[PDB]
Design a protein around this ligand. Structure first.
Ligand SMILES: COc1ccc(Cn2ccc3ccc(-c4cc(N)[nH]n4)cc32)cc1
Ligand SMILES: COc1ccc(Cn2ccc3ccc(-c4cc(N)[nH]n4)cc32)cc1
Lengths: 206, 212
């Protein structure tokens, strides 16, 4: 049984989550916790863009989080989110995902939170998004498919027809020889991993 | 001026991307994102998109005949065909920069165990094809990856949307007992830059030693 709360100034962007019982996902508009008739301001020390104010975040997380909560904060500067992370988080009772926008969230939000709950700043990959929402969708998908009750690269897969546009399915896959099929698939996976992800086998990246 | 076509059995998944686009960029003809239901190209009354894997094993494989027809209609020789897959080359910021100047991206979103390999291999005989992974975790299908790729690419298209960055701060100067680092309020901008550099170095050592 898992509860996921997602906090964002763009709740509309989290709608793809509908595409249950073991898990509940709830999306909260951060602006719900503002008192004035702005969630951001210029950075101390200077620099381009805006930083999200800690005040609004503090009030939201105060209401949503408990000491048992795992607070997840997507950020390009985070620890890497990997399959290992997904397995680890798959047995959590309560994930709260704080989605930033602009140039990110005042660092004190995570620091304050860490005084009463576990906090994980994470990156989903070495590219830059406009905000945390797409990363939340990735994290939710990767985690939920591992929830109870729900290395090397995978090689190529094939299905019918056995010949298509003059391209034939590798004959071994039609042979019904499980050992020969297992061996060919291993070789394909090895080949693919060396070519595309040599780092996985402890070799230099291109 | 970029056209992005996404092909998926879950077109609703891509709807927020389409709403994420500023009207001014669309009206200026800088960008167009179109989403297509793969089932438009199915052959049968059951609208089948998958079938059992040759050689056996778990799950299902998406049909080459259906995908072949879809890409035949949507792609041209100038298309960059992007195929998310856990077995792909890594998608990075460098990739995003490269793809940001493309006239036409087509993103083919798989589900189940993926797409029959002949689809990409056939397409590669007449257009540029890129199989890519967005990170070292497994998703249920290509749609979330497409969202990530579209966002990362389009935020590099003018006017459409190393070391780690260190912490950032804004008002108020004191909050829940935590003061903004005084150096940031010092007006010594050379010192501030050096402080930020050291914060960056420390964070990179702690979180991403692989970058060093
Ligand atoms: C100053 O450096 C920047 C800091 C933030 C941003 C945009 N942005 C704002 C909030 C936010 C949350 C997560 C992510 C993200 C995470 C990954 N792996 N890629 N992108 C990006 C985010 C741009 C630049
Ligand atoms: C047997 O190995 C598997 C094969 C496919 C799948 C699910 N699936 C189906 C299509 C598809 C497209 C992209 C991705 C993806 C990309 C990244 N970086 N993570 N996950 C995942 C995808 C699961 C496992």
């Amino acid at each position: 049984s898992m509860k996921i709360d997602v906090v964002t100034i763009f709740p509309e962007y989290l709608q793809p989550v509908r595409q249950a019982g073991l898990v509940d996902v709830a999306v909260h508009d951060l602006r719900r916790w503002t008192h004035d008739v702005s969630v951001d301001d210029s950075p101390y020390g200077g620099g381009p863009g805006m930083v999200m104010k800690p005040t609004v975040w503090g009030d939201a997380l105060d209401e949503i989080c408990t000491s048992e909560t795992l607070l997840v904060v997507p950020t390009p500067a985070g620890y890497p989110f990997t399959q290992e992370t997904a397995w680890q988080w798959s047995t959590e009772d309560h994930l709260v995902i704080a989605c930033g926008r602009y140039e990110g969230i005042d660092q004190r939000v995570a620091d304050d939170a860490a005084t009463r709950m576990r906090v994980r700043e994470v990156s989903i990959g070495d590219y830059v998004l406009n905000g945390g929402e797409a990363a939340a969708l990735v994290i939710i998908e990767a985690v939920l498919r591992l929830v109870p009750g729900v290395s090397l690269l995978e090689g190529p897969s094939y299905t019918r027809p056995p010949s298509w546009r003059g391209m034939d399915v590798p004959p071994v896959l039609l042979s019904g020889d499980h050992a020969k099929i297992a061996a060919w698939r291993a070789e394909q996976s090895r080949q693919r991993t060396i070519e595309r992800r040599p780092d996985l086998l402890g070799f230099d990246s291109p």
